[PDB]
Amino acid sequence: VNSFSGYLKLTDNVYIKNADIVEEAKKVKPTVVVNAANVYLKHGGGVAGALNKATNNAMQVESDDYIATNGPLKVGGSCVLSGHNLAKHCLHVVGPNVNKGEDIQLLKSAYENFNQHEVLLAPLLSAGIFGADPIHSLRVCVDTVRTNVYLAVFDKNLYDKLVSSFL
Ligand SMILES: O=C(O)C[C@H](NC(=O)c1cc(F)cc2[nH]cnc12)c1ccc(Br)cc1
Known about the structure:
Elements: E1 8-9, E2 14-18, H1 21-28, E3 32-37, H2 46-54, H3 58-70, E4 78-82, E5 89-94, H4 106-112, E6 119-122, H5 134-144, E7 148-153, H6 156-164
Parallel strand pairs: 2-7, 3-5, 6-7
Antiparallel strand pairs: 1-2, 4-5
Helix pairs in contact: 4-5
The structure holds ligand RKU.
């Protein structure tokens, strides 16, 4: 039993809700919140900008120190950093950004990072400003992640769609 409330169950291990991931993280304090990161950990907009803003820019400060020490992530890669006031940990995962021409097949590699964590609160990788089809992203998520994933979808319209077209 865990503290996630109000999710529709899609599979044995994938759950989905219409929620603002920032507000959901602040209320659940999950062990792991996933950020839709880029390789530079520059959290300017989308989910990343919103999560970072909710940390009063502490996520960005920590991220800049990480990059200065380690260099950029790989597309499809991840790193674990602090969750600040939102979660114990933040798993920064780099999905491919279609608006940069990155190979969508890297989306499966990106979701594989979730399997290193028993339970996660997560956005749909490569959705939103990353330009991928959120329905394809949901399919890859379901077919790749084996751990328990609670997907928050900010847009109510999108959500209702994802549910009605799910197989
Ligand atoms: O709806 C989703 O969950 C996926 C994606 N979300 C974002 O891009 C997004 C951006 C942001 F700045 C803050 C956020 N907090 C939660 N998600 C976001 C999206 C896709 C299509 C459309 Br139309 C609208 C949104």
